[PDB]
């Protein structure tokens, strides 16, 4: 298409509206109610341009650019005098009732309304009457509510209801008393409610966790990082002030997590700011806890390790690829152990084998939204991989999108699309042990034990392709549901099969692989998605190693007299009594970690490792994409006594001191080169981000905005002499504003989005090639493996049906977005959001045991009696008991295990 804006000719996409076409060309049109992810509604009337009928036209007509297609041969004017007057008048109308609140508003300096008020040139007030006011609501611990600042742009309700699928937010009232909020006070129930603080262009919805320790956007130190709270790998911009992690913003990645995070990634960062974190290396001598610097710790650890006969290392899926590799090189490949359990490791390696040997393409998170039918087997996606659940909701609304596209309705005309596709949606079939948060949009939900869900998957695969192994003993009603699923999957151009390791069943993953293979054999464009547990679960699976049980066996038998535990509390993957016994028997325990874990009581040495905010590294997400995260701030800038280094730096220096009795710390790219030289499967992590010599026309990449303040006063109470600016030898970023953050700079790692005149998250428009698309010079991150040329064989081992045995209770895993991830529990804001931990019981089993709802029952696992209250789970199958995985005292390894002597206390 060809458009003419203000006498200049441009080539645009004809499927776009005029607003996104002009914003992609670098033109500045003010807008409020339009969002790239939500479509156009034409509410705020801010995006007015003057459209002419032909080239020789003087009158024209004011039109909404967001509602007008950018068709070929269009003629418009942005800087027309009447259009400018109308846009200024719209801003003026919005300013009539706006409160005098910018100094005490958390959106100040990050406010889209401020930017568009300045952009239209409106600074003179002639309105002299009263301003309407509103009472606020309590929206929970994460979102602060202030309805005075609302401009009634309807973006919150559109995102929360139409996009996110939430139900407890709405618009109430009438003409100018429109109220946006909940029908009553209470916590916002959506797992993606935190994106309201970026969706809302004003300060109505704000980050309450940030508002506690508030600072302005210009005062932040930002870095591009990866969220560490599950395996999805959403790109984030952590921002720090005065030595503490202040905020997590969404960092745009057009391939992964484009505009949206989940609430666990946005508000679960509080463990970084915990006061009990180790800040110096501490050596235990008797009952004394002496504090060492880095060189003394390295020398003492090297001497004690050189005296030992066999030192083993226990990695973790929390740690980055470089730290796990450095531990593996320090202890040797034969002595390196992945810190996860044997069953967890088996499921993880099966998921990796399916992903990189099954011959079926695995989609990125943005690509999930383009699929035609979704079968979720075993994985409670909303509680373990939440952003995949949001993308699945978009893929489900794809049917209404296609139905509207059949009627020549443009993709940005979202109201017409939703009107045409009223309640029709793409098929979604979810299986779990109980109800899920995807059940409202699911075409069918199967509540069954993991063996029965695996059997349903195997039966679906057999019905799609008769070469697959058959399932014997299917009830005719379940057979009819299976035929419904098969007819929906076979008629789909792009089916998607989603499973993962969180179900605790190998057979569920095998069944999902069989369904994907059966759909691939029919010529479908099938995709498969495995949801792993932790941020670097896939990297630890690719690296490999022994299980935690083998390491504990080596410690208990005495063949190993030294253990180095890297960023692992060890209680989530093995029983606590066994771990404590094996660590108490070992004459040397060295724990390299950034969180105060329970195994440090038995540790002879504790190395104060850095968290993700104070470290650089690489993590591999659930789709196999290698992504680099960069250090946000120097921990030693304020507290000069803090010795908190990267885990790979600690382990590389320890290896150097063990070998040559000399301390060499490392450089990060040196460790990257060592990884890609020793482990060829991880060779793609070299291209995840450029090395430390990368420059933009000779200069580094700035971590903080140009107007960063207080540089001669932020540390002036400690000493009036300004300290040396922290050097970054590891990465291309600088710990200062003396760098480049231009939107046109040839790079993929963007620490934060700012452009002149665009201070809000709408500056990401300036950082994209086209608005709502990818980043201008490619999205960061590189897939480690391609789709295999040939696939796997059918998994023959179909499990038998679940049989409730007397005296044994099968543990059904219940995951919680606030409480199952290890480090996010440590965040103090999650305790008010984390549910009180009960145990789920069938009504039949609870009536058999004589227990009601709320009474306390006690059960023993591994010879340890613990007591919990009871809820009655109607959807849970009898013979099973439901437990909240990852909570305090309940390890995720308990999923799929059995329970004894469960009785009322």
């Amino acid at each position: 298409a060809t458009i003419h804006v203000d006498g200049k000719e441009y080539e645009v996409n004809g499927a776009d509206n005029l607003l996104e076409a002009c914003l992609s060309l670098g033109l500045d049109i003010p807008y409020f109610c339009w969002h790239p992810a939500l479509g156009s509604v034409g509410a705020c009337r801010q995006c007015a341009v003057k459209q002419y009928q032909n080239a020789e036209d003087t009158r024209g007509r004011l039109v909404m650019s967001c509602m007008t297609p950018a068709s070929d041969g269009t003629f418009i004017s942005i800087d027309d005098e009447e259009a400018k007057q109308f846009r200024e008048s719209v801003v003026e109308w919005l300013m009539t009732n706006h409160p005098h609140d910018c100094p005490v508003c958390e959106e100040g300096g990050n406010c889209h309304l401020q930017d568009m008020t300045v952009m239209t040139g409106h600074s003179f007030r002639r309105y002299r009457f009263t301003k309407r006011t509103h009472r606020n609501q309590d929206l929970g611990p994460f979102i602060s509510h202030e309805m005075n600042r609302c401009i009634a742009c309807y973006r919150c309700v559109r995102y929360y209801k139409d996009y996110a699928g939430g139900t407890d937010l709405g618009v109430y009232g009438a003409h100018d008393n429109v109220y946006f909020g909940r029908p009553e006070d209470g916590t916002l129930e959506s797992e993606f409610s935190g994106n309201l603080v970026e969706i809302c262009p004003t300060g109505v919805f704000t980050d309450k966790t940030h508002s506690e320790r508030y600072n302005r956007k210009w005062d932040m130190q930002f870095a591009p990082s990866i969220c560490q709270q599950c395996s999805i790998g959403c790109n984030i911009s952590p921002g720090e002030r005065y030595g503490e992690l202040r905020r997590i913003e969404n960092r745009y990645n057009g391939t992964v997590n484009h505009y949206f995070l989940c609430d666990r990634g946005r508000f679960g960062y509080g463990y970084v700011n915990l006061k009990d974190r180790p800040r110096q290396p501490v050596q235990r001598r008797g009952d004394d806890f002496i504090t060492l610097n880095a060189e003394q710790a390295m020398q003492g650890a090297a001497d004690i390790l050189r005296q030992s006969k066999k030192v083993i290392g226990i990695g973790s899926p929390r740690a980055s690829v470089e730290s796990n590799f450095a531990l593996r090189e320090l202890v040797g490949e034969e002595n390196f152990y992945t810190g996860i359990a044997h069953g967890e490791q088996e499921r993880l390696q099966l998921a990796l084998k399916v992903l990189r040997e099954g011959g079926i393409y695995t989609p990125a998170l943005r690509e999930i939204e383009s699929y035609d039918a979704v079968l979720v087997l075993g994985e409670d996606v909303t509680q373990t991989g939440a952003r995949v659940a949001l993308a699945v909701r978009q893929a489900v609304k794809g049917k209404a999108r296609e139905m509207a596209a059949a009627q020549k309705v443009a993709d940005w005309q979202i109201a017409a699309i939703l009107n045409i596709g009223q309640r029709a949606k793409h098929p979604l079939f979810v299986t779990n042990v109980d109800d899920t948060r995807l059940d409202d949009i699911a075409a069918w939900t199967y509540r069954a034990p993991v063996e029965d869900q695996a059997r349903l998957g195997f039966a679906i695969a057999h019905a799609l392709d008769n070469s697959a192994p058959a399932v014997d003993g299917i009830e005719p009603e379940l057979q009819s549901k299976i035929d419904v699923i098969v007819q929906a999957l076979a008629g789909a151009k792009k089916p998607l099969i989603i499973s993962g390791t969180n179900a605790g069943s190998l057979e569920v993953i095998q069944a999902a692989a069989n369904v994907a293979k059966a759909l691939k054999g029919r010529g479908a464009d099938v995709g498969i998605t495995m949801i792993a547990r932790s941020v670097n679960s896939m990297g630890l699976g690719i690296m490999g190693g022994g299980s935690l049980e083998e390491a504990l066996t080596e410690l208990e038998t005495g063949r190993a007299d030294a253990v180095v535990v890297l960023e692992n509390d060890l209680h989530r993957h093995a029983s606590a009594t066994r771990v404590n016994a094996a660590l108490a028997k070992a004459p040397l325990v060295m724990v390299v970690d950034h969180q105060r874990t329970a195994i440090m009581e038995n540790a002879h040495l504790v190395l104060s490792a850095a968290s993700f905010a104070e470290s650089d590294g690489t993590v591999i997400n659930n789709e196999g994409r290698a992504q680099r995260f960069f250090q946000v701030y120097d921990p030693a800038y304020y507290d000069s006594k803090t010795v908190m280094l990267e885990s790979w730096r600690w382990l590389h220096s320890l290896h150097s001191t063990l070998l040559s009795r000399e301390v060499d710390w490392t450089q990060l790219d040196h460790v990257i080169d060592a990884v890609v030289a020793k482990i060829p499967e991880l060779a793609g992590i070299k291209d995840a981000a450029p090395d430390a010599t990368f420059r933009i026309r000779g200069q580094k990449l700035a971590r903080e905005p140009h107007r960063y303040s207080g540089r001669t006063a932020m540390r002036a109470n400690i000493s009036v002499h300004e300290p040396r600016q922290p050097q970054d030898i590891d990465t291309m970023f600088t710990f200062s504003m003396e760098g480049n953050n231009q939107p046109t700079a040839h790079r993929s790692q963007v620490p934060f989005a700012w452009a002149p005149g665009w201070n809000s998250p709408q500056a990401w428009n300036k950082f994209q090639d086209e608005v709502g698309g990818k980043l201008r010079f490619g999205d960061p991150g590189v897939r480690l493996f391609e789709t295999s040329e040939n696939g796997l064989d059918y998994f023959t081992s179909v499990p038998a049906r679940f049989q409730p045995q007397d005296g044994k209770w099968r543990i059904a895993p219940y995951y919680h977005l606030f409480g199952s991830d290890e480090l996010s529990q440590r965040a103090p804001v999650f305790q008010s959001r984390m549910p009180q931990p009960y145990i789920k019981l069938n009504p039949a089993d609870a009536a058999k045991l004589g227990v009601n709802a709320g009474t306390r029952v006690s059960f023993s696992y591994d010879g340890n009696t613990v007591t919990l209250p009871v809820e009655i789970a109607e959807g849970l199958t009898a013979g099973q008991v439901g437990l909240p995985m990852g909570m305090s005292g309940i390890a995720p390894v308990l999923a799929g295990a059995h329970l004894e002597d469960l009785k009322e206390a």
């Binding site: 540089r711 001669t712 009036v720 002499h721 300004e722």
Partner: protein, 198 residues
């Protein structure tokens, strides 16, 4: 409370030795000869203090020697440029004991607004300073106030009377800070004149 140079020590102060030390300190604090050294705009305000409207000669501090040998006070009145820093250090080294240093202005205090590639961030990075004057520039009476502060500091320091007899260490008084001294009268301020008048 004193600081020793040759340590946080106490007062070493016969009653005739104390009287002789008081006489020497009186003569030194009442005859302070600054070194005529121009760095930047702060020097313009310093020599403004030397003129008739302010008359710093009343304190006996006007002689303004062009030679560092004859000067007792160095006023760093201006920015410490990196090319001028060895010059400043050499001129300070050519001064003879006893010698005192006044940093005048934000540049000499800390680098001021010039946190820049060619400016040393404060003269106390390389030479010791006795009195600091904030301002950009400090007004001439601020320089005279710093001169009186230096006189108070000189008036109760301890230096050897002769180089052949007695303790040769230099004891400098650990003064109470002017901020904590004036905090009582400064916080009690309630109303000021409105800025719409003269």
């Amino acid at each position: 409370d004193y600081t020793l140079t040759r340590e946080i020590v106490t007062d070493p102060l016969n009653v005739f030795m104390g009287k002789l030390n008081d006489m020497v300190n009186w003569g030194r604090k009442n005859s302070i000869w600054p070194y005529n050294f121009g760095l930047s705009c702060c020097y313009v305000e310093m020599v403004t203090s030397f003129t008739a409207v302010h008359d710093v000669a009343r304190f006996g501090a006007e002689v303004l020697r062009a030679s560092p040998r004859q000067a007792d006070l160095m006023v760093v009145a201006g920015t410490c440029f990196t090319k001028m820093a060895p010059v400043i250090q050499r001129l300070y080294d050519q001064m003879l004991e006893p010698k005192w240093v006044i940093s005048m202005g934000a540049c000499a205090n800390s680098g001021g607004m010039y946190d820049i590639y060619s400016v040393v961030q404060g003269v106390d990075k390389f030479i010791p300073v006795d009195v600091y004057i904030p301002g950009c520039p400090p007004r001439p009476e601020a320089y005279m106030q710093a001169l009186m502060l230096l006189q108070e500091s000189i008036g109760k320091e301890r230096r050897p009377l002769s180089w052949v007899v007695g303790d040769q260490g230099v004891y400098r008084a650990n003064m109470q800070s002017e901020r904590e001294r004036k905090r009582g009268e400064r916080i009690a301020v309630t109303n000021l004149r409105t800025p719409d008048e003269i």
